[PDB]
Design an enzyme around this catalytic site. Structure first.
Site: not given
Ligand SMILES: Nc1nc(O)c2nc(CNc3ccc(C(=O)O)cc3)cnc2n1
Ligand SMILES: Nc1nc(O)c2nc(CNc3ccc(C(=O)O)cc3)cnc2n1
Lengths: 265, 238
Positions: B183, B217
């Site tokens: 991330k 995760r």
């Molecule tokens: N349980 C769970 N927990 C998460 O945190 C999650 N995140 C994502 C994807 N969400 C993001 C949000 C922010 C960013 C960035 O800023 O890079 C990247 C991915 C998808 N499923 C998810 N499932």
């Protein structure tokens, strides 16, 4: 909090990575290779380079003063002229301590805590900071009644044996000696209780990189121990270990960045 | 509190850190992907348009013996995937979509809440508030999982403020699932593309697990599982 040597100070406000520069079999001058490796670790973000020419993993035989000097002291000369970095020498020999100081070493790293003949006086005489290492001491099942008490006592003893020989308490570093007369259980208990050694108010240096304490948990070759070694680095850094001795500088250094950013929010 | 979780007649021991592999013929390439993760050391596989007939839960249910979770918001996608043979429901938008709150109640499988916009206070009270709804309209407390939602309407600073104070959330006596893999909270520190964000993700994961976080995760399963042994060995010595 800081370190003082040969005019230079080193910042122990935040975790510092030391690159291992072993000089046993290099595998194109052997010096040339050492210098290229050193170079690669500096780029990567090490702020100290530990030069060792002793096959100190158990067995493999031993080395004489003259042989260590020839293998160690040129590389000390070479780096010192070439770059601005803390240079550390891991050695137990009075001669290697002496001649390496003249050559421009910043720090004496002794896994035998100056037990060797005249080592203590040689060390003191350089006025350079010294790191001491707990070792349990020749093939023996390691055992402790209580490991941390034993480490605490050993250091207490050797801090005084140093302060009486003329080495200021603030020249001193402590390393609890992962993998030195410590089974797997011991190593993780020591990692777990690391923060306890902050009571001597001296900096801590630790070396877990690609050791069997990672190998025996994950059952992999040394070169596949990068992640676990890094995970150890992260656990120690969170407990405020000042200096991490590692093989894989780039990864570790990235890792310390996350730690420091976490220790600032 | 030593923990365990049971679903669709199966047990997941939460007294040590568990790695959940992220997931996203092309169905063969996904099924091959899962296998790599299974052998790497995943013990959960998180499977991520109005209609997306996901028979992959069906494929995995039938194919393997491992926890299956789905991150979904819509009221339909939850039930049908239980038909398939899932074990856990992962929702980002914490069931805000009409119907879903109740739709996820009729299926009887674990659910995961995720915070989404004093930072910690706000999160805690938010959580406390939302746990009230779930007991109020169907699903008993010991079936809920808490995700803090890293990088979801959150500054870099804040995300690290969170990670730092993560241990505090153990006062709801519910398990935590965190997601920080590759991330922006990592990328902006290390100044590097996603593939090169492995080491930084693993470093977050260790810091999370050292604070008792039970589920992590990740994209990088083998590396993370490797890291969780070092963590477990450390916490077992204590
Ligand atoms: N349980 C769970 N927990 C998460 O945190 C999650 N995140 C994502 C994807 N969400 C993001 C949000 C922010 C960013 C960035 O800023 O890079 C990247 C991915 C998808 N499923 C998810 N499932
Ligand atoms: N300050 C310091 N701290 C160390 O930890 C260290 N280790 C070595 C090399 N020592 C070992 C010991 C044990 C093991 C294993 O079990 O695998 C490997 C290498 C050399 N200098 C060292 N210097």
């Amino acid at each position: 909090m800081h370190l003082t040597a040969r005019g230079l100070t080193l910042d122990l406000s935040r975790p510092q990575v030391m690159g291992i520069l072993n000089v046993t079999p290099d595998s194109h001058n052997n010096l040339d290779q050492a210098l290229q490796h050193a170079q690669r670790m500096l780029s990567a973000g090490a702020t100290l380079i530990d030069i060792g020419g002793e096959s100190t993993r158990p067995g493999a035989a031993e080395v004489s003063e003259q042989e260590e000097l020839d293998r160690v002291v040129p590389v000390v000369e070479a780096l010192a002229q070439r770059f601005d970095v803390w240079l550390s020498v891991d050695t137990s020999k009075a001669a290697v301590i002496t001649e390496s100081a003249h050559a421009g070493a910043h720090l004496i790293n002794d896994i035998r805590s100056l037990q060797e003949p005249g080592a203590l006086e040689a060390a003191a005489k350089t006025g350079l900071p010294v790191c001491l290492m707990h070792m349990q001491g020749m093939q023996h099942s390691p055992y402790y009644d209580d490991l941390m008490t034993d480490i605490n006592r050993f250091f207490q003893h050797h801090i005084e044996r140093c302060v009486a020989a003329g080495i200021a308490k603030n020249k001193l570093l402590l390393d609890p000696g992962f993998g030195f007369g410590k089974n797997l259980a011991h190593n993780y208990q020591l990692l777990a209780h690391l923060s306890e050694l902050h009571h001597f108010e001296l900096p801590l240096l630790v070396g877990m990189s690609r050791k069997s304490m990672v190998g025996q948990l994950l059952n992999v070759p040394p070169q596949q121990r990068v992640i676990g070694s890094v995970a150890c680095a992260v656990i120690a850094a969170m407990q405020g270990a000042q200096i991490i001795r590692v093989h894989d500088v780039k990864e570790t250094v990235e890792a310390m960045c996350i730690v420091e950013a976490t220790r600032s929010a």
